[PDB]
Amino acid sequence: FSRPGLPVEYLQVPSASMGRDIKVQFQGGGPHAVYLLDGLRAQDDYNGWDINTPAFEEYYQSGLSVIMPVGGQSSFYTDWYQPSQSNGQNYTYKWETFLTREMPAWLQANKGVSPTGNAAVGLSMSGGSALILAAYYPQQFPYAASLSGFLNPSEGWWPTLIGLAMNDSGGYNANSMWGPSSDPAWKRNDPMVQIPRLVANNTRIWVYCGNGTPSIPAKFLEGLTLRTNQTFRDTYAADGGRNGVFNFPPNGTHSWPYWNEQLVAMKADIQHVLNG
Numbered sequence: 001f002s003r004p005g006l007p008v009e010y011l012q013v014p015s016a017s018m019g020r021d022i023k024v025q026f027q028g029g030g031p032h033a034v035y036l037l038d039g040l041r042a043q044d045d046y047n048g049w050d051i052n053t054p055a056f057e058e059y060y061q062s063g064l065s066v067i068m069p070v071g072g073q074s075s076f077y078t079d080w081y082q083p084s085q086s087n088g089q090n091y092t093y094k095w096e097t098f099l100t101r102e103m104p105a106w107l108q109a110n111k112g113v114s115p116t117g118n119a120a121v122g123l124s125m126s127g128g129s130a131l132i133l134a135a136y137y138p139q140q141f142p143y144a145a146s147l148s149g150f151l152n153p154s155e156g157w158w159p160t161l162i163g164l165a166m167n168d169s170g171g172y173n174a175n176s177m178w179g180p181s182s183d184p185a186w187k188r189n190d191p192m193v194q195i196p197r198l199v200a201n202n203t204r205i206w207v208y209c210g211n212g213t214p215s216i217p218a219k220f221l222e223g224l225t226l227r228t229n230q231t232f233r234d235t236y237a238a239d240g241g242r243n244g245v246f247n248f249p250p251n252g253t254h255s256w257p258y259w260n261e262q263l264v265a266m267k268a269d270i271q272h273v274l275n276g
Contacts, residue, residue: 001054008056013106017079017094023070024103027056031114032274033065033107035099035133035141036263037077037126040169044071049263052256058264063275065113069103074165074172077122077129078189081179087171100137119143119270121206123259125165128153131191131198131205138201143273145206146191147262148254150225151232154186154193161221192232199241204273206245207233208262210252222254245269 002008011024025047036049047068049055059066072095074084080093104115120141122130127149134144153162159181163174178185187193198205209229212222226248233246245266252258 001052002050002057003054006056006060008050011106013098013103015094015098015102017092017097017102019091022098022103025050025056025068025070026107026111027060027066028111028113029059029061029065030063030275031065031112032117032119033067033113034059034119034121034270035130036066036068037120037122037129038069038072039124039126040074040165042070042072042075042125044073046070048256053260053263055260055263058260059267062267063271064119065107065111067103067107067113069099074125074169076177076189077126077133078177080177081185082176084172084176086167086173089172093177096133099133100140104140116140117142117274119145119274121145121147121263121266122149123147124149124254127151128189128191132189132194134201134203134205135191135194135197138197138203141203142201143204143206143270144198145208145262145266147208147259148210148225149191149207150228151207152190152192152228154181154190159186192228192235195232195236195239195241198236199239202243204243204269205236205241206247206262206266206269208247208252208259210254210258211248211250213254 012021038048075093077095079096083089107113116139120130120133127146130144134141166172
């Protein structure tokens, strides 16, 4: 979708913590950057944002760099306890370490991208991830967006539902990631639980949730997902949050066209927060 000729590079960025090189699609355009995180079925060739949207073209000459890490199927962009126990994964996912230490160090030294003052933007799987990244690394991420995110992953049925989704997407094991649902890692990585961090740090947060996919069990799931997002909004407000944008248009969909529309819509917001 992005027109050809844009200054998009394909970088090999070593991850010491994962023992392998991570491919990163990169468009330079300023010291502060938008980190575009992929969904549950993240591929190893291209980030879903580049496959499905004109994101690079839309942010060309925005005054912001654009970073699209490639890979991490079912990873939740988190640091796992162990290699996924069932599908033969022969290393441990350490994607939080990659995104908060290894990759920004690489981009600082080699490109001049600032490790501080950036935006994390995620969808589906990574909507919660973006918020968690800002919750724990507020200097790196004064801005976070969650598009159709799952924002109370530790609560009720959600750890089991997440486990089911991860198994469907490449046979990954949620127990290898954050342990049993009683493990402290589930609450650590739950955006709802970490709302006080988002408030204390005055993070700019952009939260979108659609009402369905363009295409009954799915209808129940989507209603539950919207309700979790609305509860997140309500809890954020109750805990003193004052720096959020909450987009719940009834005709909004869970689709790459609407997630792209949100990415374009938030551009001015990110520019104002990161570049003043």
